[PDB]
Amino acid sequence: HHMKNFFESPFKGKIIKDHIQNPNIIAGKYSYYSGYYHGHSFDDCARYLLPDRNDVDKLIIGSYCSVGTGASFIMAGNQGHRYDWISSFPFFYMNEVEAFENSIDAFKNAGDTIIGNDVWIGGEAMIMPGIKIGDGAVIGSRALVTKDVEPYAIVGGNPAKLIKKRFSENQIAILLEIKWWEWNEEVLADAMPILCSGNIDLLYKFYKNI
Protein backbone atom coordinates (compact mmCIF):
# COMPACT_ATOMS: atom_id res chain seq x y z
CA HIS A 1 0.00 0.00 0.00
CA HIS A 2 2.98 2.28 -0.62
CA MET A 3 2.53 5.67 -2.31
CA LYS A 4 4.73 6.24 -5.37
CA ASN A 5 5.73 9.29 -7.41
CA PHE A 6 4.76 9.04 -11.08
CA PHE A 7 7.03 11.97 -12.03
CA GLU A 8 10.80 11.74 -12.30
CA SER A 9 11.33 15.48 -12.00
CA PRO A 10 9.57 18.78 -11.23
CA PHE A 11 10.54 19.90 -14.72
CA LYS A 12 8.79 17.19 -16.76
CA GLY A 13 5.03 16.77 -17.06
CA LYS A 14 2.87 14.13 -18.70
CA ILE A 15 0.39 14.54 -21.55
CA ILE A 16 -2.99 13.79 -20.00
CA LYS A 17 -4.73 11.91 -22.81
CA ASP A 18 -1.70 9.60 -23.16
CA HIS A 19 -1.79 8.45 -19.52
CA ILE A 20 -5.37 8.46 -18.21
CA GLN A 21 -7.05 5.16 -17.39
CA ASN A 22 -10.40 6.58 -16.27
CA PRO A 23 -12.80 6.46 -19.26
CA ASN A 24 -14.85 9.31 -17.73
CA ILE A 25 -11.95 11.72 -18.26
CA ILE A 26 -11.76 13.09 -21.82
CA ALA A 27 -8.70 15.21 -22.66
CA GLY A 28 -7.61 17.08 -25.79
CA LYS A 29 -4.25 17.09 -27.52
CA TYR A 30 -1.05 18.31 -25.78
CA SER A 31 -2.73 19.15 -22.44
CA TYR A 32 -0.38 18.06 -19.65
CA TYR A 33 -0.23 17.61 -15.89
CA SER A 34 2.91 18.59 -13.94
CA GLY A 35 2.39 16.58 -10.77
CA TYR A 36 5.81 15.96 -9.16
CA TYR A 37 4.99 17.68 -5.86
CA HIS A 38 1.90 15.51 -5.28
CA GLY A 39 3.14 12.20 -6.75
CA HIS A 40 -0.05 10.73 -8.21
CA SER A 41 -1.01 10.49 -11.87
CA PHE A 42 -3.63 12.77 -13.36
CA ASP A 43 -6.37 10.15 -12.86
CA ASP A 44 -6.33 10.90 -9.13
CA CYS A 45 -6.86 14.63 -9.78
CA ALA A 46 -10.47 13.68 -10.65
CA ARG A 47 -11.63 12.98 -7.11
CA TYR A 48 -14.43 10.40 -6.67
CA LEU A 49 -14.87 9.93 -10.43
CA LEU A 50 -16.27 6.40 -10.83
CA PRO A 51 -14.47 4.67 -13.74
CA ASP A 52 -17.08 1.96 -14.28
CA ARG A 53 -20.30 3.95 -14.85
CA ASN A 54 -21.68 5.75 -17.90
CA ASP A 55 -24.33 7.80 -16.06
CA VAL A 56 -22.14 10.01 -13.86
CA ASP A 57 -20.66 13.45 -14.44
CA LYS A 58 -17.56 13.39 -16.64
CA LEU A 59 -14.37 15.48 -16.58
CA ILE A 60 -13.74 17.06 -20.00
CA ILE A 61 -10.48 18.91 -20.73
CA GLY A 62 -9.74 20.83 -23.92
CA SER A 63 -6.50 21.10 -25.90
CA TYR A 64 -3.33 23.06 -25.06
CA CYS A 65 -4.08 23.15 -21.31
CA SER A 66 -1.47 23.27 -18.52
CA VAL A 67 -2.46 21.67 -15.18
CA GLY A 68 -0.32 22.37 -12.10
CA THR A 69 0.68 20.01 -9.32
CA GLY A 70 -2.06 18.81 -7.01
CA ALA A 71 -4.89 20.55 -8.86
CA SER A 72 -8.14 18.71 -8.29
CA PHE A 73 -11.55 18.39 -9.92
CA ILE A 74 -14.23 17.35 -7.44
CA MET A 75 -16.56 14.82 -9.10
CA ALA A 76 -19.48 12.64 -7.95
CA GLY A 77 -21.88 15.56 -7.51
CA ASN A 78 -22.95 15.88 -3.88
CA GLN A 79 -21.16 12.62 -2.94
CA GLY A 80 -24.41 11.32 -1.44
CA HIS A 81 -24.99 14.21 1.01
CA ARG A 82 -28.02 16.51 0.81
CA TYR A 83 -27.70 19.56 3.04
CA ASP A 84 -31.39 20.29 2.41
CA TRP A 85 -32.35 16.99 4.05
CA ILE A 86 -32.53 16.88 7.85
CA SER A 87 -29.14 15.12 8.05
CA SER A 88 -26.23 15.44 5.64
CA PHE A 89 -25.02 11.97 6.69
CA PRO A 90 -25.07 9.41 3.82
CA PHE A 91 -27.18 6.75 5.56
CA PHE A 92 -27.90 5.03 2.23
CA TYR A 93 -24.20 4.27 1.75
CA MET A 94 -23.64 2.78 5.23
CA ASN A 95 -25.60 -0.43 4.73
CA GLU A 96 -23.85 -2.37 7.51
CA VAL A 97 -26.30 -0.65 9.90
CA GLU A 98 -29.72 -2.37 10.17
CA ALA A 99 -31.08 0.94 11.49
CA PHE A 100 -30.27 2.56 8.13
CA GLU A 101 -32.06 -0.05 6.02
CA ASN A 102 -34.98 2.21 5.05
CA SER A 103 -32.73 5.15 4.19
CA ILE A 104 -33.11 6.91 0.83
CA ASP A 105 -30.28 7.66 -1.62
CA ALA A 106 -29.35 11.36 -1.45
CA PHE A 107 -26.97 11.24 -4.44
CA LYS A 108 -27.39 13.91 -7.12
CA ASN A 109 -25.28 14.61 -10.19
CA ALA A 110 -23.98 18.16 -10.75
CA GLY A 111 -23.36 18.07 -14.51
CA ASP A 112 -20.05 17.58 -16.29
CA THR A 113 -16.92 19.50 -15.32
CA ILE A 114 -15.73 21.17 -18.52
CA ILE A 115 -12.32 22.81 -18.97
CA GLY A 116 -11.96 24.74 -22.21
CA ASN A 117 -8.97 25.04 -24.51
CA ASP A 118 -5.81 27.02 -23.64
CA VAL A 119 -6.59 26.94 -19.90
CA TRP A 120 -3.71 27.36 -17.43
CA ILE A 121 -4.49 25.88 -13.98
CA GLY A 122 -2.13 26.74 -11.13
CA GLY A 123 -0.91 24.34 -8.49
CA GLU A 124 -3.50 23.03 -5.99
CA ALA A 125 -6.42 24.84 -7.59
CA MET A 126 -9.64 22.99 -6.72
CA ILE A 127 -12.63 22.96 -9.10
CA MET A 128 -16.05 22.27 -7.57
CA PRO A 129 -18.60 19.91 -9.17
CA GLY A 130 -20.42 20.89 -12.36
CA ILE A 131 -18.19 23.89 -13.13
CA LYS A 132 -17.53 25.15 -16.67
CA ILE A 133 -14.28 27.04 -17.38
CA GLY A 134 -14.13 29.00 -20.63
CA ASP A 135 -11.44 28.91 -23.30
CA GLY A 136 -8.31 30.86 -22.40
CA ALA A 137 -9.00 31.15 -18.66
CA VAL A 138 -6.27 31.25 -16.01
CA ILE A 139 -7.09 29.57 -12.68
CA GLY A 140 -4.74 30.91 -10.02
CA SER A 141 -2.77 28.67 -7.68
CA ARG A 142 -4.97 27.43 -4.81
CA ALA A 143 -8.10 29.01 -6.34
CA LEU A 144 -11.32 27.43 -5.05
CA VAL A 145 -13.57 27.64 -8.11
CA THR A 146 -17.23 27.74 -7.02
CA LYS A 147 -18.76 29.34 -10.14
CA ASP A 148 -18.29 29.07 -13.90
CA VAL A 149 -15.33 31.03 -15.31
CA GLU A 150 -15.66 33.32 -18.35
CA PRO A 151 -13.38 32.86 -21.37
CA TYR A 152 -9.97 34.49 -20.91
CA ALA A 153 -10.76 35.40 -17.28
CA ILE A 154 -7.98 35.28 -14.69
CA VAL A 155 -9.51 34.19 -11.38
CA GLY A 156 -7.96 33.68 -7.96
CA GLY A 157 -8.83 33.31 -4.31
CA ASN A 158 -10.93 31.08 -2.07
CA PRO A 159 -13.63 31.55 -3.15
CA ALA A 160 -12.29 32.41 -6.59
CA LYS A 161 -13.10 35.86 -7.96
CA LEU A 162 -12.36 37.58 -11.26
CA ILE A 163 -9.09 39.51 -11.12
CA LYS A 164 -9.03 40.71 -14.73
CA LYS A 165 -9.34 39.29 -18.21
CA ARG A 166 -6.29 38.57 -20.33
CA PHE A 167 -7.40 40.79 -23.23
CA SER A 168 -10.05 43.34 -24.10
CA GLU A 169 -13.59 42.25 -24.89
CA ASN A 170 -13.08 42.91 -28.62
CA GLN A 171 -9.82 40.93 -28.60
CA ILE A 172 -11.51 38.05 -26.81
CA ALA A 173 -14.32 38.08 -29.39
CA ILE A 174 -11.72 37.76 -32.16
CA LEU A 175 -10.03 34.83 -30.45
CA LEU A 176 -13.35 33.06 -29.86
CA GLU A 177 -14.15 33.42 -33.58
CA ILE A 178 -10.89 32.03 -34.94
CA LYS A 179 -10.39 29.11 -32.48
CA TRP A 180 -6.69 28.54 -33.20
CA TRP A 181 -6.79 25.33 -31.12
CA GLU A 182 -8.80 23.79 -33.98
CA TRP A 183 -6.16 24.45 -36.64
CA ASN A 184 -4.32 21.51 -38.15
CA GLU A 185 -0.65 21.18 -37.31
CA GLU A 186 0.57 22.60 -40.64
CA VAL A 187 -1.41 25.82 -40.13
CA LEU A 188 -0.50 25.94 -36.44
CA ALA A 189 3.20 25.62 -37.27
CA ASP A 190 2.95 28.59 -39.63
CA ALA A 191 1.21 30.69 -36.96
CA MET A 192 3.58 29.66 -34.16
CA PRO A 193 5.63 32.93 -33.96
CA ILE A 194 2.39 34.93 -33.83
CA LEU A 195 0.83 32.62 -31.22
CA CYS A 196 3.99 33.25 -29.16
CA SER A 197 3.18 36.98 -29.03
CA GLY A 198 0.35 39.25 -28.02
CA ASN A 199 -0.44 40.27 -31.59
CA ILE A 200 -4.08 39.20 -31.87
CA ASP A 201 -4.69 41.60 -34.78
CA LEU A 202 -1.90 39.89 -36.75
CA LEU A 203 -3.29 36.44 -35.91
CA TYR A 204 -6.66 37.62 -37.21
CA LYS A 205 -5.02 38.66 -40.47
CA PHE A 206 -3.31 35.26 -40.63
CA TYR A 207 -6.62 33.48 -40.03
CA LYS A 208 -8.37 35.43 -42.79
CA ASN A 209 -5.65 34.37 -45.25
CA ILE A 210 -5.81 30.66 -44.43
Residue numbers in the entry: -1 to 208
Show sentences the authors wrote.
CATs play important roles in antibiotic resistance and can be transferred in genetic mobile elements. They catalyse the acetylation of the antibiotic chloramphenicol, thereby reducing its effectiveness as a viable drug for therapy. Homologs of this protein are important for bacterial Cm antibiotic resistance because they acetylate the 3′-hydroxyl group of Cm. Additionally, Type A CATs form a distinct structural group compared to Type B and C. All three types of proteins are trimers, but Type B and C adopt a hexapeptide repeat structural fold, which is not found in Type A.
Here, we determined the high-resolution crystal structure of a CAT protein from the E. anophelis NUHP1 strain that caused a Singaporean outbreak. The electron density map allowed all residues of the protein (1-208) to be modeled. A single protein monomer was present in the asymmetric unit of the crystal with the topology shown in Fig. 2A. The only biological assembly predicted from PISA for the E. anophelis CAT enzyme was a trimer, which is identical to all other structurally characterized CAT enzymes. In our E. anophelis CAT structure, we found one interface mediating the trimer formation. In total, the interface forms 21 hydrogen bonds, two salt bridges, and buries 1699.8 Å2 of solvent accessible surface area (ASA). The residues that could potentially hydrogen bond with Cm in the binding site of the E. anophelis structure include Pro8, Gly11, Tyr30, and Ser32 from one monomer and His79 from a second monomer. These residues are all identical in the CAT enzyme from P. aeruginosa (PDB ID: 2XAT29).
